[PDB]
């Protein structure tokens, strides 16, 4: 009902009151809370006095910590080569605007961009490629011969796949990060456009380099040092000069400059624990104006009045990008560190850029002469996110109603960056780490001083609940300083902690492994489930045969001698539940591969897959709690469904179905005497058979040959630098607390009184070292069958916030490179 915005200056407050008066959003009211600086507004948000503000990307990490504890919620989205159906999305977005006579993108039937676009209000038309980018020079006014627009829709990857070294592309025509030559057998990592990255080409037999996924984005902004052409100094002579900065906490005015000076060895500075950054900067520069600084000489050149001087606010006339430009223009400084947004063509006559390679270049060369890319700022609110919905509603409705959010006659960059075109909602999972990305997050963490000192003799194991925390505390109190414990809410959180330098290793099931292998983590050891062959456990060197791996199989009755694999379409099937690997992932993936129609909801007849739509075909013949007529628990994801799990899928197969998709272990578990005594009382394993991929059938005990696919074992993952330590520490702890260790009388790693299946599955025998084979790490862990079947041998089969945080953003002028 009410959204309070925190303004850091009087100009921001004037713009805020203007927006309060003019912008009318129904059911939401804008309130302007005035503070004197950015830190004061962050504190007011932390105290509940305000609801949201805009922060530079260099202020997000320090905002996610005490004494602020804020999180980004809304940010400006970038255009990339991963945008799917951009035309439909942008057309809906334009139609949702309360305005007449604006450009609504025209799309065809399939949802692609029409090669010719037209602004119906003005009559202008132009040509456009697959991503909606205007072909240069094709803008024609009304009454003039139009430019004949052809079809620029073929990605470079498939164009190089023709006329033929044959590269691998994903299902959307983008370059796969890893490239494998067929004739010579080499492996190398490539750019977002297919350019080979240096230092990655590895001959065969050698383990290939871990390739990182790349995305190509447009409209990038940079941090630049701007000088007057009348000056004569270079970059390595900045010491003793007078500088102007946009702000002490901004990337484009501080962080990037400090990083460059530390790299180029210009800044005599020990470290964050030994000396403050501001003190080294005060010793480096002469008099300067750096808003927010706490050293006197760093505020000497500022022009604010008493009480307003050197404050992180527009009350200081030298604050921000344009503030630093004004500080340089009035000869209060010799160089100005700001963003590429403040650059204009009216300045190229008097001003130029100061490149870190000790040369000077014009302004229009900022893409080749900068201190680094600067991500966009964010709207931040409290980490508890009590007002995120109202803030998002107000901002989206203000964008729909064309309110003057990103411009003002009072000044530049008030409230938001004036370069901002559109604000979109970020996923609630996004924090400072998931927003900045792994590399930038760790850079900010090292700059602030929170860089963890790695220990080569202690492993920080991550837990996912309190029972695992208690088991880990036992293991740590008995480990003798070799094991410590961190707490997370889910295995995804454990992977995030490992990527943040806060944890060291964690056991992941196969479903969590893809992302883990996509972010650079490697498997250190693997669980060994073979309850028979001991030897690869007691004397490390005995070659392992069967890892106890579960084999996904399609079980049918020997009564029904018509169900083959080449006709499964239409029959009633049984699944263990939506999400299970052998009970859903393998069969659905295989079906979507084989039959190109790709519609599982209509593929089968009345299958029972617990967790699907109650009204769809995938939730029939599911007897949900027969005794409980006081609730409808049909097709439930829990034990309240009689056909849930392996036992439930076998029940469905025995009672009403024709085929079931289960691991091979269910049959022997629910037949041959060892079975329960309610339904499986006189059932024999010879009364069933397995469907094979060749349309044939086999006895149940042939699960190693007549299998849908194999399931990889759960893998303990860690960073690459910690593999050598984690593996041997696991071996040392296993020689003491394993199934056949020295001191099992104190702690067993594979069982606990605190609970079952904590840290490791109780049925596990031991933890074998992962032998990294010289091929794709994805294909090495998953195995080529699982890789190709489920993820299509591609690194684009899935997408999430973590993978986006682990992707490199390859800046570009446009996506026109195709």
Among the CATH numbers 3.90.1300.10, 1.10.1740.10, 3.40.190.10, 3.30.70.1710, which is that of 2-78+376-444?
3.40.190.10
Peptide bond into 67 cis (omega under 30): yes
Nearest to 491 by CA among 72, 808, 802, 804: 802
Q: What is the DSSP letter of 763?
A: T
Q: Is the CB of residue 246 less than 8 Å from the CB of residue 321?
A: yes
The dihedral over CA atoms of 47, 51, 54, 58, expressed in degrees to the nearest 10, equals: 40
Architecture of the CATH domain 459-547+712-772: 3-Layer(aba) Sandwich (3.40)
- 459-547+712-772 against 551-710: fold identical: yes
Q: How much of the chain is helix, strand and coil, in % rounded to 5? A: 25, 15, 55
3-state secondary structure of 660: strand
CA 690, 696, 702, 706 torsion-angle sign: negative
Q: Specify the residue for token string 């809906």.
A: 92
Q: Is the CB of residue 11 less than 8 Å from the CB of residue 415?
A: no
3-state secondary structure of 366: coil
Tell me how far apart the terminal alpha carbons of the chain are, to the nearest angstrom: 46
C-alpha span between 368 and 135 (Å, rounded): 24
Residue 78: both structure tokens together: 């970038």
Burial class (CB in 10 A: 0-12, 13-18, 19+), 12: buried
Going by DSSP bridges, is the β-strand pair 688-691/2-7 parallel, antiparallel, or unpaired? unpaired
Q: What angle do CA 543, 547, 550 make, to 5 degrees?
A: 160
449: left (phi over 0), alpha (psi -120 to 50) or beta: left
Going by DSSP bridges, is the β-strand pair 459-463/483-487 parallel, antiparallel, or unpaired? parallel
Please count the CA atoms within 13 angstroms of the CA of 814 that sit on its side-chain side.
12
For 160-192, give the secondary structure using H, E and C. Answer: HHCCCCCCCECCCCCECCEEECCCCCCEEEECC
Residue 293: both structure tokens together: 């600084």
C-alpha span between 345 and 628 (Å, rounded): 76
Residue 351: both structure tokens together: 């001003």
Q: Say what the resolution is, in angstroms.
A: 2.6
| Cα–Cα separations (whole angstroms), residue 310 to 63, 251, 278, 285, 411 | 20, 17, 14, 16, 18
Q: How many residues are present in the chain?
A: 818
Burial class (CB in 10 A: 0-12, 13-18, 19+), 673: exposed
> CB count, 10 Å around CB of 594?
14
Residue 754: both structure tokens together: 């605190």
C-alpha span between 637 and 578 (Å, rounded): 8
Top CATH class, 225-365: alpha beta
3-state secondary structure of 15: helix
The alpha carbons of the chain give a radius of gyration, in whole angstroms, of: 31
| Cα–Cα separations (whole angstroms), residue 385 to 7, 443, 555 | 20, 26, 48
Q: Which helix (H) or strand (E) covers residue 41, if one does?
A: helix 38-46
> CB count, 10 Å around CB of 511?
13
Q: Which helix (H) or strand (E) covers residue 359, if one does?
A: strand 359-361
DSSP-assigned beta bridge partners for residue 7: 34
Residue spans per domain, the chain: 2-78+376-444, 225-365, 459-547+712-772, 551-710
3-state secondary structure of 67: coil
| Cα–Cα separations (whole angstroms), residue 308 to 19, 293, 295, 409, 793 | 25, 13, 16, 22, 59
Nearest to 319 by CA among 7, 6, 5, 9: 9
Q: b or e along 715-727 (b: 16 or more beta carbons within 10 Å of the residue's beta carbon)? A: bbbbbeebbebbb
Q: Specify the residue for token string 């490629």.
A: 129
Q: Is the CB of residue 584 less than 8 Å from the CB of residue 644?
A: no
C-alpha span between 205 and 808 (Å, rounded): 28
For 570-582, give the secondary structure using H, E and C. Answer: CCCEEECCCCCHH
Q: Is the CB of residue 39 less than 8 Å from the CB of residue 247?
A: no
Q: Is the CB of residue 298 less than 8 Å from the CB of residue 288?
A: yes
Contacts of 567 (CB under 8 A, 6+ apart): none
3-state secondary structure of 360: strand
3-state secondary structure of 514: helix
C-alpha span between 508 and 493 (Å, rounded): 11
Nearest to 49 by CA among 405, 425, 394, 381: 381
Nearest to 78 by CA among 217, 246, 260: 217
For 255-281, give the secondary structure using H, E and C. Answer: HHHHHHHHHCCCCCCCCCCCCCHHHHH
Q: Which helix (H) or strand (E) covers residue 159, if one does?
A: helix 156-161
Residue 640: both structure tokens together: 């309240």
Architecture of the CATH domain 551-710: 3-Layer(aba) Sandwich (3.40)
C-alpha span between 630 and 524 (Å, rounded): 49
């Amino acid at each position: 009902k009410q959204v309070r915005w925190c303004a850091i200056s009087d100009l921001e407050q004037k713009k805020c009151n203007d927006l309060v008066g003019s912008c009318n959003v129904p059911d939401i009211t804008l309130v302007c809370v005035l503070r004197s600086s950015t830190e004061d507004c962050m504190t007011a948000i932390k105290d509940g006095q305000a609801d949201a503000m805009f922060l530079d990307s260099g202020e997000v990490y320090e905002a996610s910590k005490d004494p602020y504890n804020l999180k980004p919620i809304i940010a400006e989205p970038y255009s990339s080569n991963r945008d799917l159906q951009k035309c439909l999305k942008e057309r809906q977005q334009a139609l949702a605007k309360k305005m007449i006579g604006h450009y609504i993108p025209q799309c065809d039937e399939k949802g692609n961009y029409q090669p010719q676009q037209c602004h119906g209000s003005t009559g202008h038309c132009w040509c456009v490629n697959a991503m909606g980018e205007k072909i240069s020079g094709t803008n024609t006014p009304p009454g003039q011969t139009r430019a004949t627009c052809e079809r620029h829709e073929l990605p470079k990857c498939l164009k190089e796949r023709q006329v033929a070294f044959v590269p691998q592309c994903d299902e959307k025509g983008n370059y796969e990060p890893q490239q494998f030559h067929g004739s010579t057998g080499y492996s190398w990592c490539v750019n977002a456009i297919g350019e080979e990255i240096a230092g990655t080409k590895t001959p065969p037999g050698k383990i290939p380099a871990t390739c990182q996924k790349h995305d190509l984005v447009t409209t990038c902004h940079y941090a630049v040092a701007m000088v007057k052409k009348s000056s004569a100094f270079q970059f390595n002579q900045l010491k003793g000069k007078r500088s102007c900065h946009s702000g002490v906490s901004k990337t484009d005015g501080w962080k990037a400059l400090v990083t460059v000076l530390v790299e180029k060895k210009l800044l005599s500075w020990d470290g964050p624990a030994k000396e403050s950054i501001q003190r080294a900067m005060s010793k480096f520069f002469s008099v300067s104006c750096i808003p927010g600084a706490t050293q006197t000489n760093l505020c000497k050149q500022c022009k604010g009045e008493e009480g307003k001087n050197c404050k992180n606010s527009h009350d200081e006339p030298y604050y921000g990008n344009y503030g630093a430009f004004r500080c340089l223009k009035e000869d209060m400084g010799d160089v100005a560190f700001l963003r590429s947004t403040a650059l204009s063509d009216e300045h190229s006559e008097v001003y130029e850029l100061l490149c870190p390679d000790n040369t000077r270049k014009p302004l229009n060369k900022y893409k080749e002469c900068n201190l680094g890319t600067v991500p966009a700022g964010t709207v931040v609110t409290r980490k508890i996110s009590d007002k995120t919905e109202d803030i998002n509603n107000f901002l989206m409705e203000a964008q729909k109603r064309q309110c003057k959010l990103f411009s003002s006659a009072h000044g530049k960059d008030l409230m938001f960056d004036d370069s901002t075109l559109q604000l979109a909602l970020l996923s609630s999972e996004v924090d400072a780490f998931l927003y900045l990305g792994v590399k930038l997050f760790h850079a900010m963490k090292a700059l602030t001083g929170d860089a963890h000192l790695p220990s080569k003799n202690k492993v920080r194991w991550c837990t996912i609940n309190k029972l695992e925390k208690m088991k880990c505390d036992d293991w740590s109190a008995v480990s003798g300083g070799a094991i410590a414990c961190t707490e997370a809410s889910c295995p995804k959180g454990c992977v995030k902690q490992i990527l943040k330098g806060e944890a060291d290793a964690v056991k992941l099931e196969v479903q969590y492994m893809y992302e883990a292998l996509m972010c650079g983590l490697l498997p250190a050891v693997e669980e060994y489930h073979n309850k028979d062959d001991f030897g690869p456990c007691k004397t490390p060197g005995s070659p392992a045969t069967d890892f106890g791996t579960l084999r996904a199989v399609a079980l049918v009755k020997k009564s029904n001698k018509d169900i083959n694999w080449n006709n499964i379409k239409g029959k009633k099937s049984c699944h263990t539940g939506v999400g299970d690997i052998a009970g859903w992932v393998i069969p659905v993936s295989l079906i979507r591969r084989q039959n190109d129609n790709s519609d599982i909801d209509s593929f089968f007849g009345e299958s029972c897959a617990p967790g699907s739509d109650t009204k769809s075909n995938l939730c029939k013949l599911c007897i949900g709690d027969p005794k409980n007529s006081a609730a409808n628990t049909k097709c439930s994801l829990s034990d309240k469904e009689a056909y849930y799990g392996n036992q439930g899928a076998f029940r469905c197969l025995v009672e009403k179905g024709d085929v079931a998709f289960v691991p091979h272990t269910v049959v022997f578990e629910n037949t041959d005497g060892k079975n329960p005594a309610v339904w499986a009382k006189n059932l024999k394993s010879e009364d069933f058979e397995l469907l094979c991929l060749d349309g044939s059938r086999a006895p149940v005990s042939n699960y190693k040959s007549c299998k849908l696919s194999g399931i990889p074992p759960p893998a303990i993952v860690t960073r690459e630098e910690s593999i050598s330590d984690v593996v041997r520490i696991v071996a040392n702890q296993q020689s003491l607390y394993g199934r056949k260790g020295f001191e099992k009388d104190m702690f067993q790693l594979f069982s606990s009184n605190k609970g079952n299946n904590l840290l490791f599955n109780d049925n596990t025998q031991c933890l074998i070292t992962f032998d990294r084979q010289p091929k794709d790490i994805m294909e090495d862990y998953f195995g080529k069958p699982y890789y190709t079947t489920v993820y299509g041998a591609s690194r684009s089969a899935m997408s999430s916030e973590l993978i986006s945080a682990c992707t490199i953003k390859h800046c570009s002028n446009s996506l026109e490179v195709l």
